[PDB]
Ligand binder design. Structure first.
Ligand code: NAD
Ligand code: NAD
Ligand code: NAD
Ligand code: NAD
Ligand code: ADE
Ligand code: ADE
Ligand code: K
Ligand code: K
Ligand code: K
Ligand code: K
Lengths: 462, 464, 460, 461
């Protein structure tokens, strides 16, 4: 009542969002377990969290868990297409500041982040940051250093954001410590891999309703996202080829039953059209970029792709695909929101029955969130249980209140302890109805662990 | 070849020409190992090395042995398991003039005697200066029984998870006398050999031992580490309905996401020692149990008593004590079907009825089943592991730990892994052997993600 | 042009964009347009059509029209229409009566609107049907219209069954072609189509993770085979129920555990007969049988809390949804997704944990909660439909003498050569290359180089 | 003093018996018939000439026929498919069997002749069980007087049925036959899932090659090609499929395989120029599954990637042009049923030559040649059908009918669906599966009897 401190597409979607949040709570036992465990302790009482992450139903359950543990938040999405408008509405209607809708312009995206940072035109009294991709983190360091003086930490969701943090640390420009949430095993080897397994073919089906069985796919990259993406397509019956620059990841692709190829002859990308394996790309029906790198589906690749191939990206940022080239040279025909036919016949107009087009999904933005709903609740449970534990840890450490000599000793980018990683995993397993076996004292002694764990040395790769 | 060569003990020297035929085939399947031969033969980096080697005497180990020799080493060899030798591999190596003491079907006494025949030459300690081990038995015998020989040894290169665990325990207790390289934890070993090797060779061994249809039947895999992951896939890809047990909730999470039901042999996961804690309804439905843990007594006597009639029991971890075979020897009658395949009649100890329906089928007497009942991992997978072995041997031999003063020795007494750059170079040769084409980063791309164009491509923290 | 009724005519441009995409996905059907356009084999045909008004059906409709036909069209399910497809067809001046979310009364009205033109029966002479509802209405309510109709081409397993029952009973009035049992229909559409579209519909309705959860698929015919694969490939632990031991054998060999909801498989009506331990572990039940009450009231009571319940057979009586309407409280999550609260009939607690999630109110879930089968699969089914329409229309049964009619009153399938010719176009659509026998090789196996390559008994 | 047999080594009998006793526990449909019909002795007076792979599984079939009252004289239908411990155990039981692994072609013919002749004269045979048609052909060509007294042939496999149908077409078939192959519990169990189990099995035993990540080309996508393709894909091979039948090719595409032809545009015109050399030069493994002739021809063999494996899982070895390889290339035996074929010439080879192919089982049925064929629990279905087929034709007593009645009965038929379903039910119970029973209302609703059959005869499963 009287609450106007938000901006969403349609507040009347709130009841629908609330119904979906109630379903999602039953799919997120690790997060709901954190709510029950810590609600009395209120470990986030006094925390004021700036949050920048895809404003989905799953993020709604994360926000309400932080709030239930005592935090106040101000929220935005980290992508212009990833918000679920009913989730945003349900959060705003609960009295929580959120600035997010599906289909933002770049200008609106920046404005939404700014509305979390500023309250009534002045810097909010923020003391914690939760980020996915590093955009909020970057704006705070470049534009609001006085705010970082009073911030105790950053908890960063995703591979790309972690890389940006490590670059700041290397350069001496990171102002507050961070937890790399991505590299919990219950994040990286759950969300990044199995989440894309679930949601990649999901988004492609919703966008195009194409049969995938029997068609040819090229997955660029075979890290955690590339592994999950390749499985998402292979399990549908696609004939999947994999490209990689890392020979260890390429080895895994071979042993997993994929043919490893390069878009470039002998894998040498010298910028000429002559370097493109036109015979290979002329047979590809679907290309997916998974790298976190720049220009891995480039202009000459796009020119050589089979007519009517689908082009999409599931890495964090759209510059994996040279969409700028396509905006400059080719005519875009909107099929429906986040689905565009790109006519390679020219820039000025198109024939409605032209056969020489590509289908681009989500304008090159994260395709699982742009054309579907991203990862499912029961996977995001893992990632967001880690986020909550990381917020608790850094808020309780109170870095901003430390003397300068003590700050220097704690300015780092760290992961959560393996014991907590395991405790999140156990809640996930119980959610499936799995029954973990308890070591006898002799067995725990034999392999050199405590019965309650941790069960593996920190070097273990799973 | 050498005139009058008698410094070996194998089952049947007439298998040597067959073994050599298979070695020549394997060379074509092991491009990383054969690349090291081509790259380093001229340099002879192992000239002067005298390697004690203890690892399964397979055709794949033959190619490893002849790679070490080609690079300048002398070796004396034994198997690290009583059932894992391929007799034609041992024969071909002996016929090449290489001391080898190994045959399929050793007794435990013969197994120990074979290791001692590598340690000893003409009744006295060989002047060994390198060790290559798989599981730590030779490492243990040297420390326990021949500690003075370790004064001349520059390093141990240890193949497998269990062996590394034993080394780390020695290091922490102050009992390890020479530095070691953990070959297991190269990604081109652990995430190639331990996983994909078992995927290939578990169902292979079960088929050769039993010729049982696997499709449609119920399996329980104990463990979901690298071997458990590969083993579960070996069975699921055949159409088994696979359930997975784990103590590690992270590994259990992966099993659930990989499409397996995660269960415990014990009610609520709690073993209280009693038969009442066994989930007898679960175990009464299981057609196949596979242990993969590297732990002790994970398929215990009460589980064995509860298993479905005519279930197959096997172990693919390094040591046989994963299964309580001792209980079965004490209480139940063993009927050999053929070598390494026994029906174990639960009707009693003394005799058995030839037509009794209440038996279990034990493979390889509970020893590593892929090597006991088939041929272990294929050459193209062992290529990764054994390329790492050669590089580790070169590294420790060139470091010359035994020649350092006692102060410098304390600084280098460690258990280390190979650097990621080398791991990557092994993988690249493996990928090329499949005909795969790795893409080269542009300078701008390499700058963008913060790597060199030549690698390494991942931080040391990366888990693949 | 006002001779239509759709949800929103302004969706026409969107539907037309998707029809142009779908044409590129349907080489067999577009090949028929190109090859028969000159002949106009359906010139003079007036086709009553009743099948899911999807984008794929739009390409079928426009193929029939391109070959000379006139049509009047309705959907064969209340939830399966894609409104943009219906709009695009209406905007092309083709009469269609169909929208997503019809009531049962509106569904019947829509069929009647195809049957009647300007308050009088249309001079129809052909029928295209999916499930047999239009066939049934013509026989029961408008039998004199059947005196001018040359044949029926029936799409699906349930409709074929209904045709054979009338043939057996002497009540079928016109000849029919069983389109379902072309191999490029039954062993393409019924199986692979459900493989594509079942997990699709479950994700769109619930966004549930499927990996690691327990499913029970009731049935293992073609739909059950495809459905089981749809779930297993996502990582579900899939159990299968069957009454047919041969289909059950296939499930075992395919790597599924075969179970019954009933102790020892005996469904004697009592709660005591339910395997409550089994059902208490199931996260998802999918019915695929074309039978009645295979997910019954006692099974629904025993199911794990928050399990998903859906049906991908033709009719919603596979699940006892009437029991649930009578006894439990329905909370709509969003269209075609309902939480059914087992706490009672009148009202519910918004935070109650004891509910089931029913998709599409028990109607065909792939069409109700997603878009049904993809264009490239429907290409096979609808190429057969066009060929079957050409064949019956040219036979001109309604014009034959009575004794000539008695000899042609049957339910037939298309010849194998045509089945193979559809398959060849589908294979070419994937870039596949079929090998041609040498004369010696064809002699050796006793076939012609042209084919057909298999005897009519071959099961593929 | 039983001497009416010839096997490799009779001392293998005890080992064979141990394996028969295990296989009995894996064959519930077949052992179910043994228990059901033992008292009635429905094959009393039957005298069966059998020609089928002398495996442990065939051992259980033979002893089921004998337990039901039959006498038999047995041979293998392939020179490499016998399991010598199975043959020894059968001989040691007093059953005439002439079979060993590694027969020459002359010995193969001699073995069949030893079943046909007893003490130098025609045996008083009155039934035939065959797998591939060689025994059936010899009887028709050489022993027509014996066929006058034979009541029927029960034929196991696709190729043998084709041969029967050709004879029926030509009016040369002299006795009726049951096509056992086309029971669903045979064709869609044995032909498909049996090859799924045993193809990668045989390749591993012959070569120990890693299959994951390598390229395979499967020629054919019928029942054997479907199972074979799955055998390789499930191991992680990248599997391409060739077909002449566009419906089978459509299935391969929808099952997630790339469909390719060895020949450019699929046109096999006999020229080297017609070979897709780029494709063949990428293939690590080629498997023929067709029942056809020369589907892996000389020009394909010349074009294959160095060190590719070549094998055949169709009934006969002429699927591959091995004659060409014998005539032009040097053969190096690696071990029994594994040969390197050196494409450098005919007159000897270099032991370190890199340009060779690996041929398994000299192109004969590779699952049986290099491993043990299908597993017992799959063969259970096929051989339950064989037993039922033998009972049916023996009880019809065709040989004793008047000429006019023979004419009405001379046919090639399948077993009725009710039997096919009952076999399937015993197989499902063997897995612990529980089939649901229709209610009366449900049976009425779909128009079937509660006991079945549940499908019309047109149903394809
Ligand atoms: N859409 C989602 O829901 C989602 C989920 C998790 C992460 N992500 C994002 O996806 C991206 C990848 O994440 P990750 O965890 O898999 O990282 P990763 O480091 O595990 O994998 C990236 C891979 O790309 C490869 N690569 C780099 N440049 C390449 C090139 N030119 N050609 C081919 N391969 C190349 C690398 O070798 C590496 O193996 C990041 O941007 C991450 O933030 C997205
Ligand atoms: N046979 C082969 O070819 C082969 C190859 C590689 C390694 N190995 C051997 O296999 C064993 C396992 O190796 P790994 O690399 O997988 O090790 P790992 O540590 O990766 O996996 C062992 C797993 O067992 C689980 N576990 C332990 N005790 C358990 C119990 N009581 N119940 C259930 N799960 C339990 C652990 O949680 C762990 O995840 C070692 O002995 C190793 O030397 C064998
Ligand atoms: N949704 C779709 O897109 C789609 C596509 C094709 C067909 N269908 C419909 O799906 C249904 C099934 O079609 P089909 O082609 O698979 O038919 P089918 O005859 O091939 O299979 C139905 C199966 O259900 C089994 N069954 C019957 N009663 C059972 C019971 N009580 N418990 C367990 N199993 C039982 C039968 O034994 C049979 O194998 C029909 O209604 C058909 O019209 C739907
Ligand atoms: N080894 C075994 O255990 C085993 C088991 C069953 C059958 N078989 C034998 O295997 C063979 C195949 O049996 P099936 O049941 O699969 O028969 P099938 O008729 O179902 O399949 C053979 C397939 O080969 C295809 N084909 C023919 N010539 C071809 C060519 N030149 N190129 C590509 N494809 C071609 C046909 O179109 C057909 O689909 C027969 O000889 C049969 O007797 C062997
Ligand atoms: N559903 C989701 N919600 C929030 N962040 C995500 N990242 C990937 N999927 C997501
Ligand atoms: N094991 C086996 N025994 C007999 N015939 C077979 N055909 C295929 N496998 C067989
Ligand atoms: K979601
Ligand atoms: K091996
Ligand atoms: K569709
Ligand atoms: K066998």
């Amino acid at each position: 009542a009287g609450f106007t401190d938000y901006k969403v597409a349609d507040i009347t979607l709130a009841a629908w969002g609330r119904r979906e949040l109630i379903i999602a709570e039953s799919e997120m036992p690790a997060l709901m377990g954190l709510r029950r465990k810590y609600a009395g302790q209120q470990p986030l009482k006094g925390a004021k969290i700036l949050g920048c992450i895809h404003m989905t139903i799953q993020t709604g359950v994360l926000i309400e868990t932080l709030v239930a543990l005592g935090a106040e938040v101000r929220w935005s999405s980290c992508n212009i297409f990833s918000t679920q408008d009913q989730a945003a509405a349900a959060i705003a209607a609960a009295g929580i500041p959120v600035f997010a809708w599906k289909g933002e312009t770049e200008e609106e995206y920046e404005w939404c982040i700014e509305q979390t940072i500023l309250k009534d035109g002045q810097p909010w009294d923020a003391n914690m940051v939760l980020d996915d991709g590093g955009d909020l983190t970057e704006i705070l360091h470049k534009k609001y250093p006085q705010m970082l003086e009073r911030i105790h930490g950053i908890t960063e969701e995703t591979t790309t954001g972690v890389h940006r943090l490590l670059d700041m640390l290397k350069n001496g420009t990171l102002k507050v410590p961070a937890i790399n949430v991505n590299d919990s095993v219950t994040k990286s080897k759950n969300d990044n891999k199995y989440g894309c397994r679930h949601s990649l073919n999901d988004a492609i089906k919703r966008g195009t309703d194409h049969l995938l069985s029997g068609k040819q796919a090229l997955v660029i990259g075979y890290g955690d996202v590339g592994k999950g993406s390749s499985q998402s397509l292979r399990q549908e019956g696609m004939i999947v080829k994999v490209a990689e620059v890392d020979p260890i990841c390429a080895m895994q692709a071979c042993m997993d039953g994929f043919e490893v190829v390069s878009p470039y002859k002998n894998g040498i990308n010298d910028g000429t059209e002559a370097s493109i394996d036109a015979a290979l790309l002329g047979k590809i029906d679907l290309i997916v970029t998974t790298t976190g790198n720049v220009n891995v589906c480039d202009a000459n690749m796009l020119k050589a792709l089979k007519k009517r191939a689908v082009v999409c990206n599931i890495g964090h940022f759209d510059n994996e695909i040279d969409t700028a080239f396509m905006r400059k040279n080719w005519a875009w025909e909107e099929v429906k929101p986040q689905v565009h036919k790109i006519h390679r016949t020219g820039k000025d107009g198109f024939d409605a029955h032209n056969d020489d087009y590509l289908i681009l999904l989500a304008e090159g933005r994260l395709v699982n969130l742009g054309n579907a709903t991203g990862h499912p609740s029961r996977i995001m449970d893992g990632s967001f249980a880690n986020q909550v534990l990381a917020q608790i840890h850094l808020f309780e450490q109170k870095y901003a209140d430390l003397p300068a000599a003590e700050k220097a000793k704690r300015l780092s980018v760290e992961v959560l302890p393996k014991k907590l990683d395991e405790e999140v995993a156990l809640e996930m397993v119980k959610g499936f109805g799995g029954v973990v076996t308890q070591l006898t004292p002799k067995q725990a002694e034999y392999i050199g662990v405590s019965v309650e764990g941790p069960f593996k040395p920190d070097t273990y790769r799973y």
